[PDB]
Amino acid sequence: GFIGSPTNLIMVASTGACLFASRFGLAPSVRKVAQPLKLADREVIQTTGDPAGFTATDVLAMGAAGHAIGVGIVLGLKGIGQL
């Protein structure tokens, strides 16, 4: 919440890591399918200038995932007495 707080830093890092994972393979996305690996799919939604398969629902889903991972990490570290 506070600018410069450790929770802000690590949750911004988590959201950016989720976005970077969605941009380049890694995390499954709209254009990524199949259970074991990730395979190319239909474009589904126009990306509106974004290269590769990166649409609005992609950034919405992975921002939600990043916020969830960040709040889980924050509360887990607060439970164990860490940052």
């Binding site: 506070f2 939604i45 509106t48």
Partner: protein, 226 residues
């Protein structure tokens, strides 16, 4: 440019609508939705466009009526006692009610509901039956209620007495600008309601607070964050 046009939504809509930026993620303008005969459901393109333009006009009037009293009361145009916030006029008596009025707020509500019921019921009957309000004698202003093929744009000697847009290009530009300003005012009234709930002040007061201190008065600082 198409503002965030979702793919596979252009398959059923071409460019005929004023705005028509191709933004339809969930999908409601599809003719396959509510296909048949008769009244049907409420999700049909004609009613969708009609409700969109009516929401646009009402939101534009609301944004004007939310800005004008506070702005003119900040200066000497409107006196301070009549320069109340838009939600403190009496629309929400918990928020505030202006007691110094020429009539009781419920009397004004009854007069308003009678007048707007006449207006919107004539509008609805013309929407169901085009040009029907010009046949039955109302007051002698039946020729003013001729209407048009599109219920969203009736025209006539009163609704468009300036007869702007003689050419089709000017009609298209005017319709696009009307729907654009209406969508902008819809988002505006959304923000006005949000600020009225959170800040408890007029939208111009919030604008002045953001102007004076950007980081010290914003959405983050509104709800307690830093």
């Amino acid at each position: 440019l198409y503002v965030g046009s979702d793919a596979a939504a252009l398959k059923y809509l071409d460019g005929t609508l004023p705005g028509d930026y191709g933004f339809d993620p969930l999908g409601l303008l599809d003719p396959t939705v509510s296909n048949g005969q008769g009244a049907g459901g409420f999700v049909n393109p004609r009613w969708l466009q009609y409700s969109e333009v009516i929401h646009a006009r009402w939101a534009m009037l609301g944004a004007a009526g939310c800005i004008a009293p506070e702005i003119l009361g900040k200066a000497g145009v409107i006196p301070a006692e009549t320069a109340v916030d838009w939600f403190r006029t009496g629309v929400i008596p918990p928020a505030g009610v202006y007691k110094d009025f020429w009539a009781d707020p419920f009397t004004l509500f009854f007069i308003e509901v009678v007048a707007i019921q006449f207006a919107e019921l004539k509008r609805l009957q013309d929407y169901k039956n085009p040009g029907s309000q010009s046949r039955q004698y109302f007051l002698g202003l039946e020729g003013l209620f001729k209407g048009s093929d599109n219920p969203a744009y009736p025209g006539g000697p009163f609704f468009n007495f300036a007869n702007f847009g003689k050419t089709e290009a000017e009609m298209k530009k005017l319709k696009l600008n009307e729907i654009k300003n209406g969508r902008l005012a819809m988002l505006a009234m959304f923000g006005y309601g949000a600020q009225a709930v959170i800040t408890g002040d007029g939208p111009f007061d919030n604008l002045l607070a953001h102007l004076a201190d950007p980081t010290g008065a914003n959405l983050i600082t509104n709800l307690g964050g830093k």
